[PDB]
Structures are given as structure tokens and as C-alpha cells.
Design a protein around this motif. Structure first.
Motif, PDB file in Angstrom:
ATOM      1  N   UNK A 199       0.810  -1.198   0.000  1.00 35.88           N
ATOM      2  CA  UNK A 199       0.000   0.000   0.000  1.00 35.88           C
ATOM      3  C   UNK A 199       0.849   1.256   0.000  1.00 35.88           C
ATOM      4  N   UNK A 200       0.280   2.325  -0.535  1.00 36.55           N
ATOM      5  CA  UNK A 200       1.009   3.568  -0.623  1.00 36.55           C
ATOM      6  C   UNK A 200       0.122   4.716  -1.040  1.00 36.55           C
ATOM      7  N   UNK A 230      -4.217   3.674  -2.857  1.00 37.90           N
ATOM      8  CA  UNK A 230      -4.664   2.293  -3.019  1.00 37.90           C
ATOM      9  C   UNK A 230      -4.664   1.576  -1.678  1.00 37.90           C
ATOM     10  N   UNK A 231      -3.534   1.631  -0.963  1.00 33.97           N
ATOM     11  CA  UNK A 231      -3.408   1.258   0.446  1.00 33.97           C
ATOM     12  C   UNK A 231      -3.507  -0.248   0.679  1.00 33.97           C
ATOM     13  N   UNK A 261      -0.473   3.026   6.322  1.00 34.15           N
ATOM     14  CA  UNK A 261       0.577   3.075   5.311  1.00 34.15           C
ATOM     15  C   UNK A 261       1.902   3.520   5.914  1.00 34.15           C
ATOM     16  N   UNK A 318       3.234   0.681   8.251  1.00 34.37           N
ATOM     17  CA  UNK A 318       3.809  -0.459   7.547  1.00 34.37           C
ATOM     18  C   UNK A 318       5.274  -0.213   7.216  1.00 34.37           C
ATOM     19  N   UNK A 319       5.627   1.037   6.911  1.00 34.99           N
ATOM     20  CA  UNK A 319       7.014   1.355   6.593  1.00 34.99           C
ATOM     21  C   UNK A 319       7.892   1.291   7.835  1.00 34.99           C
ATOM     22  N   UNK A 348       5.332   6.511  -6.899  1.00 33.43           N
ATOM     23  CA  UNK A 348       4.724   5.969  -5.690  1.00 33.43           C
ATOM     24  C   UNK A 348       5.576   6.330  -4.483  1.00 33.43           C
ATOM     25  N   UNK A 349       4.921   6.610  -3.342  1.00 35.18           N
ATOM     26  CA  UNK A 349       5.675   7.041  -2.166  1.00 35.18           C
ATOM     27  C   UNK A 349       6.521   5.914  -1.587  1.00 35.18           C
ATOM     28  N   UNK A 350       5.966   4.742  -1.245  1.00 37.65           N
ATOM     29  CA  UNK A 350       6.864   3.660  -0.784  1.00 37.65           C
ATOM     30  C   UNK A 350       7.400   2.815  -1.940  1.00 37.65           C
TER      31      UNK A 350
END
Ligand SMILES: *[C@@H]1O[C@H](CO)[C@@H](O[C@@H]2O[C@H](CO)[C@@H](O[C@@H]3O[C@H](CO)[C@@H](O)[C@H](O[C@H]4O[C@H](CO)[C@@H](O)[C@H](O)[C@@H]4O)[C@@H]3O)[C@H](O)[C@H]2NC(C)=O)[C@H](O)[C@H]1NC(C)=O
Ligand SMILES: *[C@@H]1O[C@H](CO)[C@@H](O[C@@H]2O[C@H](CO)[C@@H](O[C@@H]3O[C@H](CO)[C@@H](O)[C@H](O[C@H]4O[C@H](CO)[C@@H](O)[C@H](O)[C@@H]4O)[C@@H]3O)[C@H](O)[C@H]2NC(C)=O)[C@H](O)[C@H]1NC(C)=O
Ligand SMILES: *[C@@H]1O[C@H](CO)[C@@H](O[C@@H]2O[C@H](CO)[C@@H](O[C@@H]3O[C@H](CO)[C@@H](O)[C@H](O[C@H]4O[C@H](CO)[C@@H](O)[C@H](O)[C@@H]4O)[C@@H]3O)[C@H](O)[C@H]2NC(C)=O)[C@H](O)[C@H]1NC(C)=O
Ligand SMILES: *[C@@H]1O[C@H](CO)[C@@H](O)[C@H](O)[C@H]1NC(C)=O
Ligand SMILES: *[C@@H]1O[C@H](CO)[C@@H](O)[C@H](O)[C@H]1NC(C)=O
Ligand SMILES: *[C@@H]1O[C@H](CO)[C@@H](O)[C@H](O)[C@H]1NC(C)=O
Ligand SMILES: *[C@@H]1O[C@H](CO)[C@@H](O)[C@H](O)[C@H]1NC(C)=O
Ligand SMILES: *[C@@H]1O[C@H](CO)[C@@H](O)[C@H](O)[C@H]1NC(C)=O
Ligand SMILES: *[C@@H]1O[C@H](CO)[C@@H](O)[C@H](O)[C@H]1NC(C)=O
Ligand SMILES: OC[C@H]1O[C@H](O)[C@@H](O)[C@@H](O)[C@@H]1O
Ligand SMILES: OC[C@H]1O[C@H](O)[C@@H](O)[C@@H](O)[C@@H]1O
Ligand SMILES: OC[C@H]1O[C@H](O)[C@@H](O)[C@@H](O)[C@@H]1O
Lengths: 436, 436, 436
Positions: free
Chosen positions: A34-35, A149-150, C175, C178-179, C342-344
Motif C-alpha cells: 500500500x502507498x 490504493x493502500x 501506510x 507499515x514502513x 509511488x511514495x513507498x
């Protein structure tokens, strides 16, 4: 091929159209993890259908440093959705936004092609939201958006199915002990596998019926229930001191019924916590191999007992038990699997298993059905703990006045062993009580 | 191709022939895991030899729900045993029962063919037991049986052989320390590998002889034993303060002799517990690098000291030591292996090893010799503990008055570290004593 | 293709030339693991250049039991070094010794061929040392030597490069959590990977700039620094109570600068210990999301703060930050990698990563770039701990008066959790203090 999610789409500007809006994110083109993707949108003049390549109309998106990503507004129709994403990704687009010309927000409608390279997110928006952007882009106002989206992308629609055939007997020798050590060691793996949607486990049991020449004989009375419709050999084989096959058929049917109840509520992993605690709390040597002790585990784990005793039904009646009938029927060869004759038999993906009963051996055989980039965390040589300690304290003893519980989540699953406080090893009966 | 097991076969009915009887279970067609198969038997009219397909004579076994599995009674001869099992498995048979026409109960007698699909158990029964069933089937009496293969199927006849070349020196720098950390970390893996019959480990050591131009020189007296027949460089290299090569050759030969004694008794894994405890209990810095300290480990582990000192023999005599002669001879290239020149050399399956000395690296190289479905538990990315704590408390300290011992079985093997009782860390000398 | 090492070569005899001498060990032909090779030398009469096969001149080395290995003295020139080693290994030589005819001790000078089978060590010696041996062999004196390559052979010149794009926000939902759980779980793996030279990790961050139509607006003041040159969305999105994007851009640039400083000193793994301790010691809920709290971690880990605040520079000035400019520039597609939207996002070997964020999943993707026999210990399904506890106590609390520290090295990296002494769980603020 689009899953609808409401909070995923949000608009930051213009302020007249700011807010959260529903969108149908695509199954492909998005990453599993997810992000968040923040970027602006662009509506092309030509090829609004994205049915042809953008290099023909000389339309490129040209991402530059510090620039917001370039979402593309595509008019739905005239071509497939996957081809629209492929055309935009070639032009350098970050994501596509398909606006259905149909007014239904729920309508969401192929062959395996070269679409695995598609890595840009795709989404289907309502025609109301789509035309709201077309008007903002014609007035000279930038439309900056955010897409979350996550979802970890479960995709558990087609997973691995494994069926194990066991027996609740614990005094037949080392063969019965090998299964219990396997169920205790594999519990932690099987629970996280089923919780992640990666596996569908169905426990199965083996019973026979009394022959016509042995009907109403004494041997048929000791080993069989329901007037000799479902049988099992005596554990001890002495008969005079053995628990007789009837008690085995009852506890097997009880464990099968615990699964039949928990599978309907959506917690089949509870069957693992039941059969492991069954071998720990209700042994045959301590004469705790009774229905009373077994019902205590059903109450400790919050299992519904009414649905279990209804599934069990009348233990002695000429009627047929539906679960034991479906179990004896499940033994018959249903295609490539073949007949199930051996007592400790495991069937993975409708094909049997002959390797050793080691957990790593069973895992390595199950990770073959999974495709790459979709293998679970357990399959990828990673060891993790369970998460059953958080609800009802896993059905373990607990003292709230000291923040101390007997529950402990491990790689073997939840275990209700007495805790050690300030170096003092509390000695108690697991969950039932614990005292220093 | 049949292993004889007595308690495997038992007959439940008819009561005139009930009892346990000896049978020769087959090596193939049975699963590795142990289990139980209960079913009835059927003696065919035609093709009793099972040399032709049963579809020609229109004979099928037709397993049905609730029905006992269909064992088949085959007359031995006229065709191979593996082909008989294949014909029955096609008809749906659960297991075959070959009755040798010969009266010898011990007689038990190919090329790699398409027999891996055979999954039905096979067994060879005495002609007495075979004709006893033929008579029961002609009188109209059902013959219900039970077959417990039970064995985990070791099949360790052809396994992996690895030979390691080490030195007992501990002050030569980081090179000697890298080996000790490897032996301490690999001990737990190598022990379970050899206990399961999966590996045959032979420790080897390197010695040279004094040149003729240096015979009876002072340097040949410090580094060599048996009048300069077996040598090794000085550890410290200072000579004045170093332990001299003789003490190294003696302790190396002692460790080799510990293996020579334990290999004959059937416990070669004890060599690992000896060399690891040797580095912990008899260091050179504490001046405990003596024969007295080394004999203490031999006594703590129950190793026979007479067989060791006999293997060592005279440390100073013009005679040749048979083990050190076989060791210097083992260094010579015996085919594809080539000569062994490097001091820390490992040879797996008669071919040397160049990868890193990491345990996982050595394991991954050894699991290549194993075939699929036969890889040990350790090879299948599963981590397990040892089982040496149960005998003599692993040769560790123990206080029976408190149920507390200094033994602890881990993934690195048994370790005699002082236990911690009630939070109090007992401080002691491992096994020799332990006190708070 | 030869690395120079001084203490590797030592001569035991003749006594006139005894001593340690410098030699240039070869990159190929030697094992990765360190060790020792003791043997004597032989200077051939014909084919001293080793440019032709020794079987033509009928020269063999014939290793025998108890005999010292046969080092060969080769005259440099007329052929490649790798071919000289191949000719000697065929004759049974243990190692080659190339003496450069040139007098320079530093000069050390191909295509992929069948040279992987070369397993004998190679070395380049000074012409002085080479002619000293030629004279000792002409006088009838044996030359016994010892060669200690010893090096684990790192060969980290071409390794795996992975770039991760993260955000220091901790309240954006699951989100962001999770990181953090990924960075805490992957810290132990990434640290040992970079310490062994197997990986080059570069942390990256995402920022945008204020549009021209939004310049000097209130929204551009809350989310952006350096007069709207570098931006990030508000964490809470409420703005009134949220920390605003500026604080996020500052802490992101601070974490990037911590890497920019530590990468130049040669300790990029400290970035992992910083960002993990940042999520533990400076949260936003406790209002500890300040520069003061962040500078405390910089001081606890011994990070140079002057080089960090210089890298950060002026937080509010029309000048451009070089790191944030290089970061926004690093986002642009540089070949096969493509744009990073995308961020991650994780990029391994200049190609992005779409699989799950599990540690084992990220590891399995990184071990594909490594060749066989060079995979690190972590990659070979082996779990190991870190080694940061030994310096500054890992920046954790410590009481020297009791030999008790709050540091603990685990598979997740160093963790400054309060220690438990004598069963009493000390309750304190990790490193800042700890008390019972
Ligand atoms: C535990 O509970 C789960 C609840 O999800 C249950 O899984 C479900 O099982 C049913 C029955 O096997 C599955 O339904 C099948 O799905 C596919 C796809 O359509 C079809 O192949 C099947 O068609 C059969 O049934 C039709 C009836 O209309 C017949 O016309 C046809 O001929 C076939 O016989 C069937 O519909 C269902 O997909 C799963 N669902 C999930 C999410 O897995 C599981 O069976 C339960 N297990 C036990 C042991 O009780
Ligand atoms: C540790 O003890 C074990 C005890 O099992 C021992 O393993 C045994 O080693 C012997 C000798 O190597 C093996 O016997 C060989 O087996 C095969 C099969 O027949 C043959 O290749 C060999 O024939 C040789 O010896 C014959 C003598 O009659 C000669 O005629 C012939 O030319 C060959 O030289 C030989 O018989 C035996 O199979 C194993 N057994 C097991 C179970 O492994 C091991 O060697 C001992 N190790 C040490 C270091 O002492
Ligand atoms: C962290 O610090 C490390 C310190 O080692 C640093 O790694 C080094 O990065 C530089 C720059 O990328 C590498 O140098 C390159 O090496 C190869 C081999 O020669 C060439 O491809 C490159 O040439 C470029 O630069 C030339 C300048 O003369 C140009 O002419 C040419 O066109 C190319 O642009 C370049 O020299 C160097 O090899 C590594 N060293 C190591 C040991 O990795 C790393 O970049 C730092 N990371 C961060 C994020 O600051
Ligand atoms: C597309 O994915 C396939 C997977 O089979 C891969 O082989 C190929 O290189 C990829 N191509 C591009 C352009 O990413
Ligand atoms: C009890 O333990 C739980 C689990 O960590 C914790 O959330 C809770 O705050 C504790 N309660 C106390 C210490 O009173
Ligand atoms: C038999 O086993 C082989 C193993 O090579 C497998 O490929 C094949 O599909 C199997 N066939 C059947 C009928 O089980
Ligand atoms: C001592 O410990 C052993 C190992 O578990 C156990 O079997 C035995 O009963 C114990 N004896 C006691 C508690 O007296
Ligand atoms: C040389 O190494 C290669 C590696 O590809 C291997 O296939 C081959 O058998 C080796 N040959 C010898 C003689 O060692
Ligand atoms: C403190 O602990 C360290 C780490 O093991 C040890 O080296 C040192 O000797 C100890 N000091 C004492 C016990 O005084
Ligand atoms: O497509 C196979 C099967 O998949 C699932 C359901 O969508 C069913 O309706 C369908 O028949
Ligand atoms: O078959 C090879 C070898 O295997 C083993 C023994 O059975 C030997 O007698 C035989 O020679
Ligand atoms: O060879 C590629 C590259 O490798 C490294 C350095 O040795 C550079 O000088 C060289 O250009």
C-alpha cells in the motif's frame, strides 16, 4: 476488473471540487504494497479513448524534476482497459483515470497477454466526477489529486487447498504422537496461512461401517456409532481397558464439527487451537478424555457449542450423520486425487503428499502451488508469530491486576503456558488457573 | 527389496486366524511418514500372478464409500514385484500381499523405470500366512487386516559424505578462531544430520615429516612426534613461549582418535561435543592445554579412554601411528578430489569446497547431493534443536535436588552453561561445578 | 589482478633467508575462506615461463604422502598469469610464485574463459625475493615457506544497490506504520549487508514545488520550505492541528542529511539506527517531533551535528538545497528504472520492486543479483545478529557499576530497551535513563 474503494480518491484543488470521492481501483498495474500517489491530471485533445498510441498524435507527458505526476483522463469505450494503461505508460503517464460514459457507479466491465509490464495505477471514476474535472481543466484551473490504493492486494481468490486426515487418538504409539507434534508445530504456520487467505484447510477423518455378517455383534458395539454406520478401531486394542472405538469416533466427529461451525463463521484457524489444546487438556491417561473436558475447550475458545452438538446430532440413532457421511464420501477418489486409504494422509491441490511430515517439508510442498511475487511471508523462509493473544487473551489464564497473562503467541501458535513473574515460575493448569 | 518387520501385520478377523504375523514391507510404494492402513483382502480367480493387466480379465476392485480397502493376494513368481503393484494400483487396489511359494521366510529376491507413481504399499508374507488366507476366503469368511509400516523410511544407505580438515590450535590468530566459531555453530546441524543417517562425517588432520637433512635437529624435536614422522608448525611461532608443534600433533591425534573410537561404537557426533568443549574447557592461555584437562572431557562425555590412548599409542617411538599414517595417506588425491593442501579444507561428495565457511553456506552445498523428497529437516530451511541433554545430562553439571541442570540443547548443540534459577545467575565452571 | 599483502608470505628455511616478506596474492585461484598453506618450492629447468604445458618437457610435481606441497617459481612474462596457474595445477602443483622481472614492487599487470577450475593459490613476489630463492635452490638448500591468504575475500567491487523512498510521517494511517515496521524489521538485515560490502543503500525522499498560481498562498506556506521549492502534504490533513508539511520536509531532509554525513565517513548503516530510534524517541503524539529531540538522537549515536545542519542549510531562504535538489532530480527516470511516482518505492539494481514489503520478500529479490558462491550469510537462509553493541554501547543506557547495559543486538538491529536485572524489569526511557 476494478475493485471499488471510496476513501482512495481525494482532490486537493480546485477548492470548488475538493473532497473525497469514490473510485474503482484496478486489480493490475498497482503494486501489492500500500502507498500513496499525489499528482495532477491532464485531459488530452486527441485520442481521448486511448485506443491508439499517443506517439501518432505526438502527445507526450514529459515528467520533469519537481513536477507533479501526470494522471490521464480517458473516455471509456472503444478499447480494453488494459490497452489504455499500456498506451499511457509508454508516454510516461503515472496513472490513468477512466470515466465510464454509463451513469451506473457499480458497473465494472482479458486473455493472458503482455500486460505484466503495466506498473501504472488504474482507476474507474463516476461520470459525475469525470465531467467535473473536464470543466475544471477547460477553465484554466489545475486539478491536484491524491490516490491511496493502500490495500496489500490480497488476491486470495485462487489459493492453495490442503486437506489433512488425522485421528484424535493419543495412545496408539509413536504414530499418533508424530501427528500431535506435527499439529502443534504446524499450527502457527497454518493459522497465518489461512488468515492471509493463502490457504483453505479442511480437516478430514476416516470411518468405516459394520459388515452385514457382523451387525449387532459385540465388536460392532464397541467401535461404531449410529447403529454401526461409522467406525474406528479401539485405541488400546485391549478393549477391556481401552476407550473403545466409539469414543474415538465421537471425538473425531466433534473435532470435524468444530471445523464445520468455525468455517461458517469465518475462523477455521480456531480448529488448530482446539485440537492442540485438546491434546494438552483432555488426555486419555488422566481419564479427562470426556465430553465434559472437551466442552470446556469449546467454551474457553468462545466456540458456539449449540452449533457443534447439532452438527454431532444423536450419537446413537439409525439416522446418518451428514458430516461423517460427507467424510466417508470425501474419501472416494474425486479425479486426480485418488482414494484415501492411509490414515495420516495429506492432499495438496487435489494431489496427495508422500514426503516427510516435517513442517518445512509440508511448507516447501505448498509453496510450489503459489506463483512468484505472491508467495506468503511464511513461504519466503521467514518465521513469524501469531496474533490470537489479542482476543479473549487467546482463551488463556489472565490476571488484570498485574498486567500478566498466560497467553503467548509463538511460531507454533498461541500457547496457554503459565507465565513467569519476577523470576517465580507460576505453576498452574495453563488457562484454567495459574498460581505461584 | 523388502524389509522384514514383525509387528506390522495384524489380523482382526476371522477369529480363528487373528493375531500378529511377520511380513516383509516393501522399500517402494509406501510413504516415508509412518501410519496405518486397515482393510480387507481379496484373492482373484484369474491372473493370480499379477503378471498381466487386470482389465483383460475384467477384474476391478471398485472402492466405494465406507468400504474397507481392497488388499490383493498375489502368487509370487512369473513377473517382477514392482509390476505386480502397478497392475493392482491401476485396478484401484490399496495394497498388495505377495505370498512366496518358497517356504523360506527370509528370502527376499530392478532397473530404473516408471515406478515412482506406485503409491500403494507392498508386502511379502510367509507361505503359511498366505495359504491361511486362501482357506478363509474359500469358506466365505471376511479377512480384515491392519498394516502398520510406521517406519519413517530412513533409506540412509547412500547419503552425503563430508570430510573436514581442522587444527586444535587456538592462538594462531583469526584463522583458528574462525574454525572454532564454525565448529560451535555447525555442531547442532552436523549432529542431527549424522543421527538421522543423512551424513557421514570424518574429521581429518594434516601432518608432515622431518626432512632427512633436518633429522634430529632441534626444530624437528619441537614440532614433530614419533621421531619426526608426524609434524605441525609451532602455534605461537615464538618457540620459547609457544606450546611447540608436538603438543598440537598430540591433541590433533587425540581428537582424531576420539572419532576413531566413537565411530566404531556408532556415535560419531560425540566428536563434535568433544572438540567444542575442548575449546571451552582446555585453553592454552589458562595453561589448561594439557592431557589431564583433555582426559577430563573424555570422562565427562563417557568416551572410552582406553580405546583412545591405544589409538594414540606411544607418542615418542620410531613406530608409525596407524591413524596419523592413514591421515597423511588420506591427504593424497584419490580420484576427482585431488590433493588436500589448504589447512581449512572441506570435501563434500569427494569434491572440495571453496565457498565461505558460513553454516548456511556449507548446508546449501550439502543439500545439493540430496534428492528431492529426501532432504533432511535441517536442509529444508527448518531450524531444530539437539537431543543430547537426555543422556548423562549431556555431561553437564546437574543438581537433582532442584530439578535444575546446566545442560541446554540448542541449534548449536548441547551447551553446559550454568543455569539461571529464580533470576539468580549461577556463576560456575560449566559442568565441573555451578554455584550461585 | 593481484592484491598486495605483506604478512602473508613467510619463509621458515633456509635460516639465512628466513623472515616475513611482501607478496601480491591473486584474486582468483584462492578460496574465499582464510587459511594457511605450508610447503616447499621448486624451480623448473625448462618452461620457466609456464607458457606451455609441463607434460611436453616431462615435468611433473608428483605429490606424495607426508610430502610438503610443491610451490613453483615462474618467471613473469611471455604469457598471461591465469594460464601459468592452469599449467601448474595440471602437473599437480599446490601454488605458483610469479617473480616479476621488473623491479617495481607495486606494478600488478582477462576475458572470461575456462579459469573457474583454477583452485591453486597464486602470488606475485618481488624480484629480490625471487632471485633469493633461485640462489638457495642452486646451492642444495630446501626452501620451506608458509602462505596465509587469510582474507575472507570480500570482492565487494560490484554488489547490489537498492534505493528506498520513505517518509518520516507516523500519523498518516497504516501506510506509514507499515514502513516503520519494515524499517525496524529490515534494519538488522540491511546493516549486516552494508557492513559486509554486499549492498549500497541510498535513502531517498519525495518533494514537490509550489505552482506559480499558488505562489505565496497560505497552503504553500504550510507544506513547503525554501520559498516553496520543496513540499510535502500535511500529515494529519487537518492543518489546524496537523504538524504541517514543513515539519515533514525538515525531518525528511534531516534524515537524508544524516545519510549524507554518514556515507562520507563510511558508516551508512547508522542511518538505520537513526530512523528507527527516531520513530521510538521522537513521536508526534507526545509533541516530541521537534528539532531538539532529533538532535538528541544525533548526539546519542555520535553523529556529527555540524555536518548535518550544514547539509540542511537555511530552512527558509530562496536558495536551493543541494540534497533536496539532488533528491527531486533522483526521482527522474534515469534509464531502465523509470520515474518514481509511488511514495513507498524500492529500486533494486536500477529496476523497481513491486512485491510485498516483507523482509524475506525484499531479501529474496536482492539475492537474485548476487551470484552463487558469493551470496551473503543473510541471503543463504541464515539469521544473524548485529554488532553495534560494542561501540558507545550502541548509544544505549548503561551502568558500568553492574556490568548491565540497555543495549541488545538482535536480528532487527541494536535496540535500547531497558534491561531486566535479577528478575526486576527496569522501567525507563530506553537510553536516556533506566531505573527499577
Ligand atoms: C468452508 O466454507 C467456505 C465458505 O467460503 C466454503 O468455500 C466455498 O465452497 C463452495 C462449495 O465448494 C464453493 O462454491 C463453488 O465455486 C465454484 C465457482 O463457482 C464452482 O466450481 C462450484 O460449483 C459447484 O456448485 C454449483 C452449485 O450451484 C453446481 O452447479 C456445480 O456443478 C458445482 O458442484 C461451487 O459453486 C465456493 O466458491 C467456496 N468459497 C470460497 C470463498 O472458498 C468451503 O467449501 C467450506 N468447507 C467445508 C469443508 O465446509
Ligand atoms: C566409520 O565406521 C563406519 C562403519 O559403518 C565405516 O563405514 C564403512 O566403511 C567401509 C570401508 O570404507 C565400507 O565398506 C565399503 O563398502 C563398499 C560396498 O561394498 C565397497 O566399495 C568397499 O569395498 C572396499 O573394500 C573391500 C574389502 O572387501 C575391497 O575388496 C574393495 O576393493 C574396496 O576397497 C567397502 O567394502 C562400508 O560400506 C561402510 N559402512 C557404512 C555403514 O558406512 C567408516 O569407514 C568409518 N570411518 C572411519 C574414518 O573410520
Ligand atoms: C556514498 O559514498 C560513496 C563513496 O564510495 C559513493 O560511491 C561512489 O559514487 C561515485 C559516484 O557515483 C562512483 O564513481 C563512479 O564510478 C564509475 C567507475 O569509474 C563511473 O561510472 C562514474 O563516472 C562518473 O563520474 C565521472 C567523473 O569523473 C564522469 O566522467 C562520468 O561521466 C560519470 O558521470 C563514477 O566515477 C564511485 O565508484 C562510488 N564508489 C563506491 C566505492 O561505491 C556514493 O555515490 C555515495 N552516495 C550518496 C547517495 O551520496
Ligand atoms: C515485462 O515482464 C516480463 C516478465 O516475463 C519481463 O521478461 C520483461 O523484461 C518485462 N519487460 C519490460 C519492458 O519491463
Ligand atoms: C496491560 O498490558 C497491555 C498489553 O501491553 C497494555 O496495553 C496495558 O496498558 C496494560 N495495562 C496496565 C499496565 O495497567
Ligand atoms: C509419475 O511421477 C512423475 C515423476 O517424474 C510425474 O511427472 C508424473 O506426472 C506422475 N504420473 C502419475 C500418473 O502420477
Ligand atoms: C526433573 O525434571 C525432569 C525433566 O523434565 C522431569 O521429568 C522430572 O519429573 C523432574 N523431577 C522432579 C520435578 O522431581
Ligand atoms: C570447472 O568448473 C565448471 C563450472 O562451470 C564445471 O562445470 C566443471 O565440471 C569444472 N571442471 C573441473 C575439471 O573441475
Ligand atoms: C562487563 O561486561 C563486559 C562484556 O562482557 C566484560 O567484558 C567485562 O569484563 C565486564 N566487567 C566486569 C564484570 O567487571
Ligand atoms: O469463473 C469461475 C467462477 O468464479 C467464481 C464465480 O465468479 C463464479 O460465478 C464463476 O463461475
Ligand atoms: O551393490 C554395491 C554394494 O552395496 C552394499 C553391499 O550390499 C555390497 O555387498 C555391494 O557390493
Ligand atoms: O573499469 C570500470 C571502472 O572501474 C572502477 C575504476 O577502476 C574506474 O577507473 C574504471 O573506469
Amino acid at each position: 476488473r476494478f475493485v471499488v474503494e471510496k476513501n482512495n480518491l481525494k482532490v486537493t484543488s480546485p477548492d470548488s471540487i475538493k473532497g473525497i470521492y469514490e473510485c474503482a481501483i484496478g486489480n493490475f498495474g498497482v503494486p501489492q504494497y500500500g502507498g500513496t500517489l499525489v499528482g495532477t491530471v491532464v485531459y488530452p485533445k486527441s485520442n481521448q479513448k486511448a485506443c491508439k498510441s499517443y506517439s501518432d498524435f505526438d502527445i507526450s507527458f514529459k515528467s520533469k524534476p519537481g513536477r507533479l505526476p501526470t494522471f490521464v483522463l480517458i473516455d471509456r469505450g472503444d478499447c480494453y482497459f488494459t490497452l489504455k494503461a499500456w498506451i499511457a505508460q509508454q508516454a510516461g503517464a503515472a496513472a490513468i483515470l477512466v470515466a465510464d460514459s454509463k451513469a451506473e457507479p457499480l458497473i465494472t466491465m482479458s486473455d493472458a497477454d503482455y500486460l505484466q509490464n503495466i506498473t501504472i495505477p488504474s482507476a474507474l471514476i463516476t461520470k459525475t466526477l469525470g465531467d467535473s474535472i473536464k470543466s475544471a481543466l477547460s477553465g484554466g484551473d489545475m486539478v491536484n489529486m491524491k490516490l491511496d490504493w493502500t490495500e496489500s492486494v490480497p488476491h486470495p481468490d485462487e489459493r492453495v487447498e490442503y486437506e489433512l486426515w488425522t485421528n484424535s487418538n493419543d495412545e496408539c504409539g509413536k504414530k499418533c504422537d508424530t501427528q500431535i507434534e506435527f499439529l502443534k508445530n504446524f499450527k502457527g504456520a497454518a493459522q497465518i496461512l489461512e488468515k492471509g487467505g493463502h490457504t483453505q484447510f479442511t480437516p478430514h477423518y476416516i470411518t468405516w461401517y459394520c459388515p452385514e455378517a457382523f451387525t449387532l455383534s459385540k465388536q460392532c458395539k464397541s467401535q461404531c456409532i449410529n447403529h454401526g454406520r461409522y467406525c474406528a478401531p479401539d485405541p488400546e486394542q485391549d478393549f477391556t481397558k481401552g476407550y473403545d472405538g466409539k469414543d474415538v469416533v465421537v471425538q473425531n466427529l466433534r473435532q470435524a464439527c468444530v471445523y464445520r461451525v468455525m468455517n461458517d463463521t469465518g475462523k477455521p484457524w480456531v480448529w488448530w487451537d482446539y485440537v492442540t489444546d485438546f491434546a494438552i487438556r483432555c488426555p486419555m491417561k488422566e481419564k479427562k478424555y470426556t465430553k465434559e473436558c472437551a466442552d470446556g475447550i469449546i467454551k474457553s475458545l468462545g466456540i458456539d457449542l449449540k452449533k457443534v452438538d447439532k452438527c454431532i446430532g444423536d450419537p446413537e440413532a439409525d439416522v446418518e450423520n451428514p458430516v461423517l457421511k460427507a467424510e466417508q464420501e470425501s474419501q472416494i477418489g474425486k479425479g486426480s486425487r485418488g482414494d484415501v486409504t492411509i490414515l495420516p494422509t495429506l492432499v495438496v491441490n487435489n494431489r496427495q503428499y508422500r514426503g516427510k511430515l516435517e513442517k518445512g517439508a509440508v511448507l516447501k510442498a505448498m509453496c510450489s502451488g503459489f506463483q512468484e511475487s505472491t508467495e506468503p511471508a511464511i513461504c519466503l523462509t521467514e518465521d513469524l508469530e501469531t496474533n490470537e493473544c489479542l482476543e479473549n487473551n487467546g482463551g488463556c489464564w489472565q490476571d488484570k491486576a498485574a498486567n500478566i497473562t498466560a497467553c503467548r503467541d509463538t511460531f507454533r501458535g498461541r500457547l496457554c503456558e503459565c507465565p513467569t513473574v519476577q523470576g517465580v515460575k507460576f505453576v498452574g493448569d495453563g488457562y484454567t488457573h495459574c498460581k505461584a
